[PDB]
Curated annotation (Swiss-Prot), chain A:
Belongs to the bacterial secretin family. T3SS SctC subfamily. Disruption phenotype: Insertion mutants are hypoinvasive in the HEp-2 cell assay. It comes from the Bacteria. This is SPI-1 type 3 secretion system secretin. It is found in: Cell outer membrane. Coiled coil: none annotated. The gene is sctC1. It comes from Salmonella typhimurium (strain LT2 / SGSC1412 / ATCC 700720). The chain holds residues 155 to 205 of 562 of the full protein. The core secretion machinery of the T3SS is composed of approximately 20 different proteins, including cytoplasmic components, a base, an export apparatus and a needle. This subunit is part of the base, which anchors the injectisome in the bacterial cell envelope. Forms a stable homooligomeric complex. The complex is composed of 15 subunits. Component of the type III secretion system (T3SS), also called injectisome, which is used to inject bacterial effector proteins into eukaryotic host cells. Forms a ring-shaped multimeric structure with an apparent central pore in the outer membrane.
Swiss-Prot record, chain B:
Changing F14A: Can only secrete early substrates such as InvJ/ScpT, PrgJ/SctI and PrgI/SctF. Can polymerize into filaments in vitro, but not in vivo. Cannot enter cultured epithelial cells. Changing V65A: Shows a specific deficiency in the secretion of the translocase SipB/SctE. Shows fully assembled needle complexes. Is able to invade cultured epithelial cells. Changing L54A: Exhibits constitutive secretion of substrates. Does not display SipD/SctA at the tip of the needle filament. Is non-invasive. Can polymerize into filaments in vitro. Binding of bile salts, including deoxycholate, to the PrgI:SipD interface may inhibit the T3SS function. Induction: Negatively regulated by PhoP-PhoQ. Changing I74A: Abrogates host cell invasion and effector secretion. The lineage of its organism: Bacteria, Pseudomonadati, Pseudomonadota, Gammaproteobacteria, Enterobacterales. Belongs to the SctF family. This is SPI-1 type 3 secretion system needle filament protein. InterPro entries: T3SS_needle-like, T3SS_needle-like_sf, T3SS_needle_YscF. Deletion of the last five residues prevents self-association and yields monomeric proteins that allow biophysical studies. Forms a right-handed helical assembly with roughly 11 subunits per two turns. The location of the negatively charged surfaces are radically different among the needle filament proteins PrgI, BsaL and MxiH. In PrgI, the major negatively charged surface is not on the 'face' but instead is on the 'side' of the two-helix bundle, and only residues from helix alpha1 contribute to this negative region.
Amino acid sequence: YVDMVVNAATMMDKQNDGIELGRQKIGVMRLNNTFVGDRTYNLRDQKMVIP
Amino acid sequence: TPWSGYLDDVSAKFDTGVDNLQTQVTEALDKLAAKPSDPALLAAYQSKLSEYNLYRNAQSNTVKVFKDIDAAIIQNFR
């Protein structure tokens, strides 16, 4: 009984080891009060840009 | 601020040195074209055109010389 139990358990353990459980997700977020992209202003003769 | 190199600065020195020549040289022509036979108009325009000519020449040759001084140094990094 003891030997069967220990063997079966140790085989089950290495068999299930390929299961992948860590996963990535995508979150969408709208800005309400500002422009999302890097922002250009044109001065009289020149563009200048803010991150 | 707007992005500008060192050649841009050397170039803009002239544009800010000649305060208004770029407009005067145009207006002088506009007047002259109205009555080509007026000698006073001709006399004025001659001097303005000549000054604009020399301004563009000096402006270009200087930029060229600083480009070469830079390239010579860059070449020696290796």
